[model samples]
Target chain A: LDANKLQQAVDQAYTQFHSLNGGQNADYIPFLANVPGQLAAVAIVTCDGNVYSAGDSDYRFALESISKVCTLALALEDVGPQAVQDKIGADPTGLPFNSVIALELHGGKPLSPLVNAGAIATTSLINAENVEQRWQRILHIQQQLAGEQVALSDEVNQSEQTTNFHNRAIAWLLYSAGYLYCDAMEACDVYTRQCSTLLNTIELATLGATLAAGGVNPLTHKRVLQADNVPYILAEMMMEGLYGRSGDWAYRVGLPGKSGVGGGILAVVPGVMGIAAFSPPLDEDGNSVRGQKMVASVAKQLGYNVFKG
Target chain B: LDANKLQQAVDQAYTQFHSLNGGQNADYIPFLANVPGQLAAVAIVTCDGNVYSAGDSDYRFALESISKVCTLALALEDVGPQAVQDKIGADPTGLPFNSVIALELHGGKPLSPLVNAGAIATTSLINAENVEQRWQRILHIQQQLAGEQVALSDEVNQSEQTTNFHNRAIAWLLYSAGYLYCDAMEACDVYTRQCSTLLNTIELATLGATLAAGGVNPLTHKRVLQADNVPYILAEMMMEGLYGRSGDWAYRVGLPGKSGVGGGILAVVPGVMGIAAFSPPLDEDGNSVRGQKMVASVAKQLGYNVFKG
Candidate 1:
């Protein structure tokens, strides 16, 4: 509970991970290449209502797959865990996140919410009056979590929409298998748009803080959702958070985290704090290199492990 | 820990898991089929020199792949981790225990000591004048750990030797790839003998305790190997200790343990104790079904996790 010690640990993490130059820009999305490869951001919003940030903490970037976390929170609220479980399964796919065969192999059941296929399935569960309503709800919930306005990056959105043909096939396949709740193309479009939304590093950190606060916004003192659903969300993050490298990630940090190809990573320690980092370069598993290093560095230095203290 | 409470927990685990029926016996080898699936054994030996056991803790069974743990300790002693790293390897295969494609894919680098290819390579690393001397050293080390005489199960050994075609193929493959040190067949024979060696529940528990005691025999107070290599061995167990189910295993128990097709599991809590369980039935992943559940039950109750205490 020492503020100065925590700040020192954060600074050490920032300095250590700032020079990390491995991992590459995700080449599947064209717009992702335009993002700075070396711009690493580290921020933490504690349950005690304090913000600690270092490196490029104000840099803005598309949420990419990270938007899945917000949408999952909303979905858990709108339909509850029972419906979420019954509709979209809750097992780690045990395959690559983007593997199309996983969709067919599991009979259209997407293994986890963090993967592309499962993210689309989760988006279909938003319980909206229409597709526009669903999109609005996602953005609104995200803003509430961050305690600030967050907008979609239209350029990235359009870029993903055009390049998301594989996702389109996955969505239709899920629909044909009767696993998807809404129209295939519409669900896939909304899911892509969700990923294309932009979040500054500060906002990203608060969004994680919301989960850490048990769905309560530490900044605005607003309760976003029930405390019960937070564990389920974090559990999902535990399994498929870092795509294929989730095992090593869990072993190292031993915390629940979600990573995106946009080089965005979000980690939570239920009642203590939420951590967020953004870096444009990704490792083979589509996780942020600098972001992961920074988070692990800080967590290890602070003796933070979900399975431990 | 309360010794009486631990004994009570061990008895509870044995009672609960003994009647739990599912999973298949290992039919790959002919002799393994007769081991009796319902005879579950649970035992633990603390580094502080306390023993707790329940049910058929005296029933002898083949060590199977659990032998790799002993051979690994010896290999680390004879050649050190640097030679072991270059000769065998350190990374988990992240595949099934006997996957040939993994050997081909890593360009003949046997991934970890837990897997067959790597275990054979590790068996060859023991500084021996001949294959017989190599095996004598292996048994000598194992005896020191178990604190008792442990000889091969000849019936099981000969059965496995006659029926070890798949392993024979894997062994020769590694030899052809420059991974094996001694004559390919000799190393394979020694490894086969290694697996064929027998250990009852108390002895298996003692072996695990030996490692948990920082390479010191818990029962005999004998130093078996260097303390430094224990972490390396435990880390490998954390990754592929239960073959393909290692990830789920870690998620449940949050500790390091290894399982054998002989329905044996060995786990360690460094400086605290070593735990072992035996039941002949195995899940599809080749882990002892009852053994895993029982060990996990006791670990959860004790709140044991490597990342934790």
Candidate 2:
């Protein structure tokens, strides 16, 4: 785990895959499709606070589904692990990120916080007095983890808010099933707003670095979440991070990773480093194409797979 | 990890869970139900060839679904990893191990070799000339991996053969979907016979240890598989080993494990050791009750989770 070697690997991956092409910008979400499809970046932040990046690492993109990891961290801190499991399950849905059938299939419990229904359920589970308090708490946690203030992309949020009829249905279903803890629409809006938070590749990598560093943000040197809660988050990522293709990702990369439709992915090598990749294109499973390629290459070259020594 | 401490952990898990009583014998399989429900055991085989065991480690039990791992190893060797992935996928079903719905949902692809549909598909894909030849190859792989001759339990085989209508249906489904490469019934029978092979807890541990040792059987010092293919098998186990609850098991145990209705579980801590647990009682998910407790206890005590440093 030499810094020079890590940087060289990241640079090599960037050079190798910058022109690699496949997948398309997310069209279901209107704003995501408008982001420059040619944009690409890869960044890494080690537990020791070293940062390495290449390509368009400074380009900011919508947070998208990756915010679920942050909101889940807050939920874990608020209600504790046992309550979280009992209320919102940690199992894989084995379905798409927005799958309503998964909710019905898993007995109405949001099987994992990484999915849409579970993310809303987790947002509702945050220990706050009201909607505003909950949203503020989520924002604070994300900022602390990223070691920077993140702004909500109003354009992206509005685009999704109007078109998220499916997610609204999921939120309502959870509420009716008694799995949701807060007002359904409020939870949906807060969840959508959180997903709209803008983050560049480096900032996103810092979030993974904090989790990799046992819940301490290496950039800020501040504890954002309990060390014990980190494993649960990583476990969720391993089970369902890349939507239905998470198992394939785990098989190939051997790391816990989360992908967003906004062309970003966060993968963690626990107690080692966090890697972030960005490109405004997604496969059918809503995973970033080049982003996955970049992370898999880095993990392979660095021998950072958690499954092996 | 120290050898003395590893032995102590195995001993501790045995003493802690041997008397634990909750689950019942698998009644669906008549022969399994007749096995002594009080029998329990835990065994470990390290990469360095050290063996640690306690309780009823020598009591032979039906191999059951844990045989899927051995067959998968054989398939990987016969056709290589890419062919296996293209023919029999390595994704999680996120449903029960025997779920037919998973097959329909995943577009007829037997998404993993650990599931019934995929296992049969995998068995059909083994390079062979005839039915007898395929069975011989499977038997050879099992013996090579276990470092001992494994006897087929005719009672268990006949018991399952008579009542495995659901598995037969899964086989036909795969066959019709173009996933099954051989005669559906032949593949089904071959899979069942492999599952019926009897293995004591220590022998079961040896199978996992062979994988942990990168395809080398410590007991016999024989290379049964290529080290490169080990990761694919472990990835399958991690994604779908405990049936419908595989995600939860992965979350709690943080190691790749496979469970069988015969009251056995094989968990691997890659490059370290393999832990096997057995009892004649079953959970609703078809996993061993005391077996899960034993492995989880040992993993927790020794910090063997692959997700952590």
Candidate 3:
């Protein structure tokens, strides 16, 4: 990984797509709909060292679905991947992100942790006596991954929570399936709250870099999750990080990339670096259109595909 | 479905997935796990009046969940997508296709027409004024789609129903929620029967081709469905046609395709052609792995996707 060159890749990628307006801001949730499309961002954090960022590097955007990945990792660390697998599943459900249909289809088992149903299940599996304990553990792991104290966006959280009927439905369904260890509302609330947690490009990259560094935060030399749990979470990310387009992402890009409706795409090259790109405008898939282009551009330039020998 | 080019694409696609040994056969039903992996098939039927095929194109296989698409179109035709939307929205469930939770979560409505829950709900929407009339209409539309009389495979139907604890649960939930207009067992039995309707690759292609021709049987050149209803059905297929990976398929392949657990994939290039492929082995997602590879590979080769121009 060439720092200056990779930075140039990030910069050019961002510059090219920054003004390129395609895709809509997620209008499903009100707060998400109002995000500025002009605020495009890009970031890269190497496992050993170095941070490269451009555009809105520090503007707090909702972590959105990327929050699921961190919590999934935490749950794996807390309860072990075996338990997680037994509870929901480790495989990808050939379905969409927020579907509860998969809950009973797989005999109450969630196909993977990236989808909302599985994410809620994974969140519930976070070893905690209460919702607060589970949420704190989740937040702590995220902070440790980012190597910084992150703030929760009250507006985003409230907006997502208020409109979280779909999630609540999914949580309750998972509860019926016996996937929920915690209360359904608590699980749904915590999941929504974590999703509403804010992150800038740098923090996003730092978090991705932590996973690239084998569950240890390279920036702080802090272990956020067990090294053994890293592969399991990465695999989870690999299945549906981008929710629907994750298969194509992995097939084409060959990285464990997770996407968020908040116009964020998070990708890690196992031993290389963590990269995140955020732009408010999104394609129909709920992924940042240019952000995806930027990451793919970066990956292509760097030969960073996981499938590449 | 033009003779040379489409056949070449189908043949090449078979090779693409034939070399793949990754995904396994569907084992949830126990019976499906024993399907022979050696026989892979692909076919294309153009609305412009052409037929192209390769591999075991004539091999009869269970329609499985692809029956949902035809039933959805019929439901939309009978009740209109507007009324269908009120009963069950045309949005993706964001979960796997066989979910029961969405019935209650979305307030007794299935999230969309492609999922099994919505399929059953959509099936219930068919107006026959009675349960027997509902089954007759369901079978009739499917035959019209293929331009040939279709046969229901008793073995597969019985097998799915016997092990259909999940579908039964979903039906009962819908019944409890009043989503099912038909009796719970009647709806489940009839849906399973429709799924058990056997179709070879060419037959599946014909079914897809009819939709491609905008609800007219291309081979027969006769109107079977309303032209307006075409987009509604295609939209549902695009939403989650291959279940969870539908987003990936739509993003990459840019076409509408649905998969059945019985090693089949039904793909449509609206206004152009319908494609079908089969291979017994399935990915963990319960999709025909080779069928998926063939469609995606063929879609890539031909540049045929609804998203593309």
DockQ of each: 0.11, 0.67, 0.04
* Structural similarity to truth (TM-score) of each candidate: 0.80, 0.98, 0.55
Please, what is the whole-model Cα lDDT of each candidate in the order they appear? 0.80, 0.88, 0.77
Q: Output the worst ten-in-a-row residue range by lDDT, candidate 2 chain A.
A: A300-309
lDDT of 3 by residue, B118-181 (tens): 7887787788777778888989888888747578877777778788788888888888887788
How far does residue B134 in candidate 1 sit from its true spot (Å)?
4.8
In the range A8-90, model 2's lDDT, one tens digit per residue, is 98899899997788999988766776888989999999998999999999888988889999999998898888888888887
The DockQ score of candidate 2 comes to 0.67
What is candidate 3's DockQ?
Answer: 0.04
Per-residue lDDT for B114 in model 3? 73
Chain B TM-score for all candidates, comma-separated: 0.97, 0.98, 0.94
lDDT of 2: 0.88
lDDT of 1 by residue, B146-221 (tens): 8566888888888988988888898889889999888888888999998988888889989888888878886887
Please name the candidate that would achieve the greatest DockQ relative to the true structure.
Answer: 2
Candidate 2 lDDT over residue span B1-309, tens digit each: 598998899999999999898989988866877899999999999888899999999999988889899999999998998888889986888788888889898779988999898999999999889999999999889999985668888888898889989999999999999999999999999998999999899999999899999999988988889988898888888888887788788778889999988899889999988999999888788889999999898888888787674
Lowest lDDT block of 10, candidate 3 chain B: B300-309
